[PDB]
Design an enzyme around this catalytic site. Structure first.
Site, PDB file in Angstrom:
ATOM      1  N   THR A  37     173.983  -2.591  78.739  1.00 49.59           N
ATOM      2  CA  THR A  37     173.048  -3.524  79.353  1.00 49.59           C
ATOM      3  C   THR A  37     172.294  -4.318  78.293  1.00 49.59           C
ATOM      4  O   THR A  37     172.243  -5.548  78.340  1.00 49.59           O
ATOM      5  CB  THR A  37     172.036  -2.788  80.200  1.00 49.59           C
ATOM      6  OG1 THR A  37     172.683  -2.311  81.383  1.00 49.59           O
ATOM      7  CG2 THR A  37     170.878  -3.702  80.556  1.00 49.59           C
ATOM      8  N   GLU A  54     165.018  -0.464  73.198  1.00 50.44           N
ATOM      9  CA  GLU A  54     165.197   0.890  72.723  1.00 50.44           C
ATOM     10  C   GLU A  54     166.276   1.396  73.644  1.00 50.44           C
ATOM     11  O   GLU A  54     166.043   1.602  74.829  1.00 50.44           O
ATOM     12  CB  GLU A  54     163.937   1.715  72.895  1.00 50.44           C
ATOM     13  CG  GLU A  54     164.169   3.170  72.608  1.00 50.44           C
ATOM     14  CD  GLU A  54     163.428   4.058  73.577  1.00 50.44           C
ATOM     15  OE1 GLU A  54     163.758   5.266  73.650  1.00 50.44           O
ATOM     16  OE2 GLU A  54     162.513   3.547  74.267  1.00 50.44           O
ATOM     17  N   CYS A  66     166.231   9.674  76.342  1.00 53.83           N
ATOM     18  CA  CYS A  66     166.869   8.999  75.217  1.00 53.83           C
ATOM     19  C   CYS A  66     166.694   9.911  74.008  1.00 53.83           C
ATOM     20  O   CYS A  66     167.625  10.157  73.244  1.00 53.83           O
ATOM     21  CB  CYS A  66     166.181   7.657  74.944  1.00 53.83           C
ATOM     22  SG  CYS A  66     166.224   6.467  76.298  1.00 53.83           S
TER      23      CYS A  66
END
EC number: 1.2.1.24
Lengths: 480, 480, 68, 65
Positions: free
Chosen positions: A238, A256, A290
């Site tokens: 994305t 990020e 993440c």
């Protein structure tokens, strides 16, 4: 389940100051019980070109208020969150799936971001440089970039929205927010709180939309020329695409993305602590972050002594169950395709040499539930956001880095080591953005979160984050 | 013409420490006399994937040297430039076309960039943040990004290469440089000086290449994954394309593109000074600069009193001729298509209402020579890098801004105004990156050069520039 | 017409044990008077791959209960 | 803008009203030469000489409301 205040909950996207229902809606369900949680407004592009407007216009005036004023509003907001933790919490657990505690965990870590930035807003400092020429005096002001597009992941439906927007508005910018339809309520709940706090209409907007329009709206806000900035947190794919939309208009950007996370345990490393962080890192939110310590790297010496000690701790306290359920450690994963991302990896490991140490199959609750797992002998030829931590044996510190630094991933890495020296070397050569020393949780509103090499651009939070929303204007004062 | 030191001159691209001739060459000619200036190595992609290597490898070791050490080398370089001004100068005039003075003008403004950054290199400061949790101590180091791709325009064949690379290497990075084949020698001359200074092989490279490969090599270095960064100065088109190549690999970036430049003269404005800056801004290098005060905006009051006073000053000292020719003010434009960019505009103005005030046709030397020009009554429906300054009459300060801020251009804008108050308002509402107050030249190695909204990303020079080459690594020191 | 028990009537598809509303609905009308009879959940494929699941899982256990 | 830019001495208003959105401050322009011909609160004035011409222009065919 329910019982919360009708206000903290919302379903009509919030644009320009007032709620606005979408032509058509999309359903949101507790990734745990399956229970439907009302239909949310599904914003289509036509709305963005309209949200980006009332966002713009709100700027042309917000750019004016005294920094003290905006610092006042933010605080007034940070408060409204604090005075709502227990309700703002449920909102997260219910849509994220994650244990209730981790919800409060997020909710605070969220408000605390508004709080801090509220302070930063009053400290944007220009400079006064000295130059040769006697007749001219140099000046440097910093000013807001204007409108800012904000897209946020699902795993932190509140903290991911707060940390960007806090700063954004700290430097006097306007934001348009497209949350992850998995967890869009926390985005609207904020909205409600922001209005109450008194945020001038259009300074903070939310525009829920499901997959069907996630691509469209995507460029919709990342292209609309009123958007001079774009902040995003998510998947590498994305991201790279948005750039392609920002390139076309040379917008300001900060992202990020994903990124594995090496958790190197050395011999001088204390085990009970190494097994400490170890747990809190790859099992928080159920290893759906993440900064989720992906692959554990352990030194032969303390290797076996690790896993045994590690797995033992798992069984001891990793209570898989419902998020709002008392005494719960793990929760659901998001959705079906997710339990499949784990399932996959788990088999390609066992099948290719991986002595499973705990769990391995879908939990006996099925759906989006999985029993945490630990494997070893996991040779690197097998490298996933799921409650699964694979152990990899190594010899040299050089190698341990050599592998961890398996380039093109620079999010967060952790390592335990009682040698003062070894700390510095490892921690500096570690090509990442955040290193956790003898600790497994490195969250903090006052520090710089972000990655390096392809794991992202710019940072969020800390005295260093509010810059993501300023532009420098040198002003050569002459004629003297 | 010739007579310079064989060393300062070069034709074989400089890669990894040593000269390396290109499979085939491309000619470079004095944009003034037409006289050929030898064939330069024309680097093809195969070389980049090779230059980006020896650039990378040079990094893996340069990232090591004491900041004091690199500060030492830079200085040692800044010197070699200073001890060569008069030769490094000719090199510019000869390939840029610009008057010899403006050459020295550039040459100093160049060395001075190495000089300054040489100092900055010793002041990259990490931080020590205080956090709640008693047991953990937060740290923040800043570290070099690694390899950096550098593309530079033709108009400042030395200063444009120095200001980026100085910083680049200040923060301990390695650079690969593709100069504008119009003026590639100054890029190689540096190279020679850098080697002599003692820059470790591969830290600074140059790879000349003409149009034919400018597109190829383009992505060649802007894609090669060893390049973690890209600095570029040029046309909006080229820029937007590189992004598209950096997006694919989430590289770090900073660009400064074209951008008109409003020169607002108010009534309180002193004329002799307003006509001062006015001249030095739109006639330096012969109005061939990004920061070339494009359209002059003048307040009815002082309008006529301006132009008359302005045009009169032109005739008085704008001596069109050869660059190395004594008493020369204007020089050639680059090349044929350039004199056509001026020619065009000039006619679409006269033809659509523009009372020419001075000059208007190709100079009587032809080729790439044009007699400066001044027009008025120039209604905005006619908006070009050439020695041509059009005057536009206005009424309100609001309007003067209203027009100047004709969005999507934020490079540099200038205005003259004796009212202390009016200074602040204009200068702050001015959506640009650099404002020249009662001065027409705002160049300075110690200040932040760059634009806003689509005129670029990041800044170059000043305590603020060296950051374009660092990545922050938060390090949560725990276990205490 | 109306008057029936709110329970016997429904509009949200029933999957896995609990009601679940469809992203979008479709109208149902008395083929006689034309009078509209509320909007029903209009299940899209994404739901099936999800209904077929909770249907499966329910099996892995129903296959167990005593025939009695 | 295509009027101001091509000769139209604005007489009142000209930019979006200071409420923005779908709000505009009414406007009046003149010297508006016919080479600029819109449902909005905007009335442009066009100077003429003869009645014949006044019709000549008004009757600029293919419009009969």
């Amino acid at each position: 389940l329910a019982g919360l205040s009708a206000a903290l909950l919302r379903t009509d996207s919030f644009v320009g100051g007032r709620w606005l229902p979408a032509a058509a809606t999309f359903p949101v369900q507790d990734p745990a019980s399956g229970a439907a949680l009302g239909m949310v407004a599904d914003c289509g592009v036509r709305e963005a070109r309209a949200a980006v407007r009332a966002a713009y216009e709100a700027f042309c005036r917000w750019r004016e208020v005294s920094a003290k004023e905006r610092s006042s509003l933010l605080r007034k907001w940070y408060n409204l969150m604090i005075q709502n933790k227990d309700d703002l919490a449920r909102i997260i657990t219910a849509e994220s799936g994650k244990p209730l505690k981790e919800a409060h965990g997020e909710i605070l870590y969220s408000a605390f971001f508004l709080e801090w930035f509220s302070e930063e807003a009053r400290r944007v400092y220009g400079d006064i440089i000295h130059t040769p020429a006697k007749d001219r005096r140099a000046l440097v002001l910093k000013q807001p970039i204007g409108v800012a597009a904000v897209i946020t992941p699902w795993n932190f439906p509140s903290a991911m929205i707060t940390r960007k927007v806090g700063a954004a508005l700290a430097a006097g910018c306007t934001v348009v927010v497209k949350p992850a339809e998995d967890t869009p309520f926390s985005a609207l709940a904020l909205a409600e709180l922001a209005s109450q706090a008194g945020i001038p209409s259009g300074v903070y907007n939310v525009i829920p939309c499901s997959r069907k329009n996630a691509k469209e709206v995507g460029e919709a806000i990342c292209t609309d020329p009123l958007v001079s900035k774009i902040s995003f947190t998510g998947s590498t794919t994305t991201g790279k695409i948005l750039l392609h939309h920002a390139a076309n208009s040379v917008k300001r950007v900060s992202m990020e993305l994903g990124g594995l996370a090496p958790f190197i345990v050395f011999d001088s490393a204390n085990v009970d602590q190494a097994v400490a962080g170890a747990m809190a890192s790859k099992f928080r939110n159920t290893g759906q972050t993440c900064v989720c310590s992906n692959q554990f790297l352990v030194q032969r010496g303390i290797h076996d002594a690790f896993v045994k000690a590690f797995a033992e701790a798992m069984k001891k306290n990793l209570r898989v169950g419902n998020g709002f359920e008392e005494g719960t450690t793990q929760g659901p994963l998001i959705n079906e395709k997710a339990v499949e991302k784990v399932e996959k990896q788990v088999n390609d490991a066992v099948s290719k040499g991986a002595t499973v140490v705990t769990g391995g199959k879908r939990h006996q609750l099925g759906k989006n539930f999985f029993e945490p797992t630990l494997l070893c002998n996991v040779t690197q030829d097998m490298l996933t956001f799921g409650p699964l931590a694979p152990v990899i044996k190594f010899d040299t510190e050089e190698e341990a880095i050599a592998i961890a630094n398996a380039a093109d991933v620079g999010l967060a890495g952790y390592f335990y080591s009682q040698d003062p020296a070894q700390i510095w070397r490892v921690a500096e050569q570690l090509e990442v953005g955040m290193v956790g020393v003898n600790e497994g949780l490195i969250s903090s509103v006052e520090c710089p979160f972000g990655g390096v090499k392809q794991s992202g651009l710019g940072r969020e939070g800390s005295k260093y984050g509010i810059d993501e929303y300023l532009e420098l204007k040198y002003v050569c004062y002459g004629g003297l």
